[model samples]
Target: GKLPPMYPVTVPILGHIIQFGKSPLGFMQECKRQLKSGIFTINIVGKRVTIVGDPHEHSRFFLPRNEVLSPREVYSFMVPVFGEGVAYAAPYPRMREQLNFLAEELTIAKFQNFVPAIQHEVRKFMAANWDKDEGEINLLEDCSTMIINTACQCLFGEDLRKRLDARRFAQLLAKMESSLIPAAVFLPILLKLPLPQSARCHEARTELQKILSEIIIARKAAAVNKDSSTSDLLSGLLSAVYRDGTPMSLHEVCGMIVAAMFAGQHTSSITTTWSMLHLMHPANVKHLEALRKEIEEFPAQLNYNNVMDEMPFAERCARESIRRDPPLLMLMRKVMADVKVGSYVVPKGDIIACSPLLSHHDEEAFPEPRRWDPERDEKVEGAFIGFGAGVHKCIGQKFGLLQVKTILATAFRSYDFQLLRDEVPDPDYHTMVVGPTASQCRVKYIRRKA
Candidate 1:
């Protein structure tokens, strides 16, 4: 297949460096503007990253063999935040072994047993916030607590849940998010510098690791003595083994738990928060009303099992939010060997990056891509890759969607919602992950009067 001529532009030795140094997401937008094609080549900090606009291109990078492609080693920049040898970072047989553990242990049967924990956490979150004099809480700030509590209760057992502080956990997550900057792209040396943000991130990692490690040790001791009854993700990892049924080491267990926590909280919280904000907009309110009516007919109230089945309209809206502003705007893949994608040669050692934002906004694929339309998702196919595509696609995607739908369902069921009049939450352009800067939404949770 013959492709269009390569768009000619002044791409310097490190053309993308200056732009990316200013804003990574903005850099992608500029690349899209200049190329006017789904794929473009840009130089960032002395490295060549092929910026892709097509989902087919994104899949080429995401779904690759371990021999040719590996996300853990590919995204090594994350190692500082989630320690080395973590499940997302592990290689070959070990990584495959752990992923198998994740599937088998965190299966539908195991996830079902944690319904009570989710119920208890949701109740606590709403009761604490629903009574505020302002009656409106920042959905962004409030949702993190709910997610962390849910993660703790479901993964670490009840005793550890009491010791976890959601606020501090949120702070730790913020510290981790900060590390995406002065990243490997800027200079390998920047990561080596012991600056304040890096120091904070290091400390947060230690604190998080300490908490996870303690839980693992306790779980291990219980396992040895045959007294274990915990049903959290940590326990699942512990009881898991290779096909031969061997126990995971203490360090491996801690790494997997922390990896899941980081992956679970920050992205889940941001997407969930943004979805709530979009749903409250004036144009979307009537649709929201119908959604609420639809969900009210569910047999079970806002628990994980029934939540997904009940929240079709809410899910559609959430999908639209991700399409409009995907949390992970672009994903990076390092080329293994010279390969032809369409007619162009992606040279060996080149770094290929794909942007869903570009594709999602393509007028051809999504009419009125800028507009908020939930119906588009239900009516259309091949319309989104907010979660990416292929083998390395978000492993816990179901959990992420379920979390958002669950929060929206639980919160709206009780409160009549409204956005904060004074403070409009703005996108944190500084972040590599595009999300709300403050995530603050003021709403009056007026209880339905008896």
Candidate 2:
């Protein structure tokens, strides 16, 4: 099979790295257009980075086993933060088991009490930050804080929250997150040389492990019932048995928590901010009114039945938000064996990337791709990769969706919001993860009357 067409490299050393670093979406879209094919290759600093930009060919990118399309090396940059023997750093089967445990913990049965827990946290945020009849605030910052608090409320027990706390957790997560570099995906050698930066990652995970040791000791001392914290993520992870019949080590458990917190914290918050921003805009008032209409009859305290089963409109608003601007731009795999996509074969060692940002914007799948249309559905079946697809489809999205949908119902129920800008904020591509520009996320909140 023919290799994917290449986007001609103007600069021999830089390849297309300069263009990609400038605007990943723009660069990818231009490549798709200019190459006359969705599947194409571009060199990034002497490395072969192939794009599976075609939505119809998405399965070709995601369906391969890790042995065939490995994640370990591509994600090695995160090892310093996620710890040495955890996540992608672990053997494939063990990594799958660890993610399975985290996934099983966040599954629906565990989310029964989560709606009320999330609503209570949302109200606490409102009371603390938006106490007046009307107030101005940064929607991105406020939503992020709410996501952090609500996550801790649902996942961590009161005793755990009392010790490490949400702010402290956010601080540690951020320091580790800050240490990641986008270029490291192409050149992992950069991660090999970090101690000041690497020291922060080591210290943060170690600091968390120390707190975990203290808590586990106390948990045994108190002889807390095996069933007592069944709903908690930490307790679930602590109790999990591997196929080998060993419990997750302290480092493994903490690494799992860091992964959950990192994924849920920023991605969910960005999705929520985008949903709210879209709904609050005058252009999407019809969609917002429908969201209000869908949840209008629900009680003040939301439950699983209300948010999960009864709020399709609210779910669509959030889904459409991510479709408009997915937080994770590039979901990549290191090709271990040659893989065919349409007429193209992505060879071994090439960085095979399926970009959610690029796929979600496919004109065939989404007409007038920039429009924030909640009622619109993807014209192509698997066009949306916001949570990915196939083998590595996000295990935590049910919980992430719950977090975003609950925030939308609760926030809009209590306070009506007005976007301060004339249009929805553009997706800022400068960060390791994509989100709306912080400067443009300003909004006014006016408490709705009974």
Top candidate, metric TM-score: 2
Model 2 pairs in collision? 195-199
Please give each candidate's TM-score. 0.86, 0.97
For residue 159, model 1's alpha carbon misses the true position, in angstroms, by 2.7
- Candidate 2 lDDT over 356-398, as tens digits, reads 9999889999999998888899999999999998889998889
Best by lDDT: 2
Instruction: Give the clash count for each candidate.
Output: 3, 1
* Native-to-model Cα distance after best TM-score fit, residue 43 in candidate 2, in Å: 0.9
**Candidate 2 Cα deviation (angstroms), residue 20:** 1.2
For candidate 2, what is the TM-score?
Answer: 0.97
